[PDB]
From a paper:
SAP05 is an effector from a plant pathogenic phytoplasma that mediates the degradation of host transcription factors, including SPL and GATA family proteins, by hijacking the 26 S plant ubiquitin receptor RPN10 independently of substrate ubiquitination. Specifically, SAP05 folds into a tight globular structure consisting of a parallel five-stranded β-sheet (β1-β5). Although SAP05 carries a single domain, it utilizes two opposing surfaces (hereafter referred to as Lobe1 and Lobe2) to interact simultaneously with TFs and AtRPN10, forming a dumbbell-shaped structure, in which TFs and AtRPN10 have no direct surface contacts. In summary, SAP05 bridges the TFs mainly through electrostatic interactions with a hydrophobic core, whereas the SAP05-AtRPN10 interface comprises predominantly extensive hydrophobic contacts.
In the SAP05-GATA18 binary complex, the ZnF of GATA18 has a type IV zinc finger motif containing a single zinc CysX2CysX18CysX2Cys zinc finger, in which the zinc ion is chelated by four cysteine residues (Cys154, Cys157, Cys176 and Cys179) located on the α-helix and the extended loop. This zinc finger motif is evolutionarily conserved from plants to animals. Upon inspection of the complex structures, we found that the Lobe1 of SAP05 creates an acidic surface that interacts with the complementary basic surface of TFs. For instance, in the SAP05-GATA18 structure, the guanidine group of Arg188 from GATA18 forms a bidentate salt bridge with the carboxyl group of Asp106 from SAP05. Simultaneously, the Lys185 of GATA18 is salt-bridged to the negatively charged Asp106 and Glu107 of SAP05. Furthermore, Arg182 of GATA18 forms another bidentate salt bridge with Asp108 of SAP05. Apart from electrostatic interactions, the α-helix of GATA18 is further stabilized through hydrophobic interaction between Ile181 of GATA18 and Ile84-Trp85 of SAP05. At the edge of the α-helix of GATA18, the side-chain carboxamide of Asn177 is coordinated by two hydrogen bonds with the carboxyl group of Asp66 and the backbone carbonyl of Phe81 from SAP05. In the SAP05-GATA18 interface, three pairs of salt-bridge interactions stabilize this binary complex, whereas a single alanine mutation of the negatively charged residue (Asp106, Glu107 or Asp108) in SAP05 or the positively charged residue (Arg182, Lys185 or Arg188) in GATA18 diminished the binding affinity by 3- to 40-fold. Through sequence alignment and structural analysis of AtGATA and leafhopper vector MqGATA (Macrosteles quadrilineatus), we found that the three positively charged residues Arg182, Lys185 and Arg188 in AtGATA, which form multiple salt bridges with SAP05, are not conserved in MqGATA.
Author numbering:
A (entry chain A): 152 to 189
B (entry chain C): 37 to 135
C (entry chain B): 33 to 135
D (entry chain D): 152 to 187
The structure:
């Protein structure tokens, strides 16, 4: 598995993203969730 | 030592890997990241936001509860001590040195 | 109306405000808040200023939770918002108050 | 006035507590009502 945003192979948790479930690393998935706050 | 009701807990470790044995710090620390991070909320491995201009040997900052503004390279350690926003403990993780 | 979630007979109402000060003027719900507390709270029963119990691990912008009916477990730092949605215990509406985050 | 338990001076309602009338802030007095 690889992060759609940062291309990392190493994360403690694969997270939801624009490209699908489990598509972002833990850091990018948390940034994404922050971005989607309204 | 205390900001309002929040206690400031400095903990010094033998190495960053030692934090893996610590409950509940081990479920909030993201060990794959470069540079010390803080959490803006309670979530799995939530310590991901970059602390600004971090002092040497700082490993991370964990707020035990509540939420705060979550941005990269915006808040210094000293700013973060004022941003508990209801957390009862702010844990500040340090790598020991021998000087 | 159509996008609103339900849990059993209970409807989940997410109402958004500019700030907690706006809620002070919101009848008939302001009377249940305790505006001196830090961090979002939920009520264990119906009574004035009843929303004092601290929600655990809250998400950003959550300002409080008001169950309009019945009673439930009343503890600090024990129940997350998701647990609370299963704790209506007969309430017909769960009002969840949010602070607007400017995009 | 100050809450005998948490020491706040701000509360929407002073409540009775084991130490005396109106000695608890709103939250502390609701917690006290809960624990008998
Ligand atoms: Zn990523
Ligand atoms: Zn009190």
């Amino acid at each position: 598995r690889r992060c759609a945003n940062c291309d990392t192979t190493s994360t403690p948790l694969w997270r939801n993203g624009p490209r699908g479930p489990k598509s972002l690393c833990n850091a990018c998935g948390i940034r994404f969730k922050k971005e989607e706050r309204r | 030592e205390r900001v309002g009701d929040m206690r400031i807990v400095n903990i010094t470790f033998s190495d960053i890997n030692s934090i893996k044995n610590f409950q509940p710090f081990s479920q909030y620390f993201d060990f794959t990241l470069t540079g010390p991070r803080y959490n803006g909320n309670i979530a799995q491995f939530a310590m991901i936001w970059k602390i600004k201009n971090p002092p040497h040997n700082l490993l991370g900052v964990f707020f035990d509860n509540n939420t705060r503004d979550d941005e990269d390279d915006k808040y210094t350690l000293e700013e973060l001590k004022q941003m508990g926003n209801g957390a009862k403990n702010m844990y500040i993780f340090w790598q020991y040195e021998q000087k």
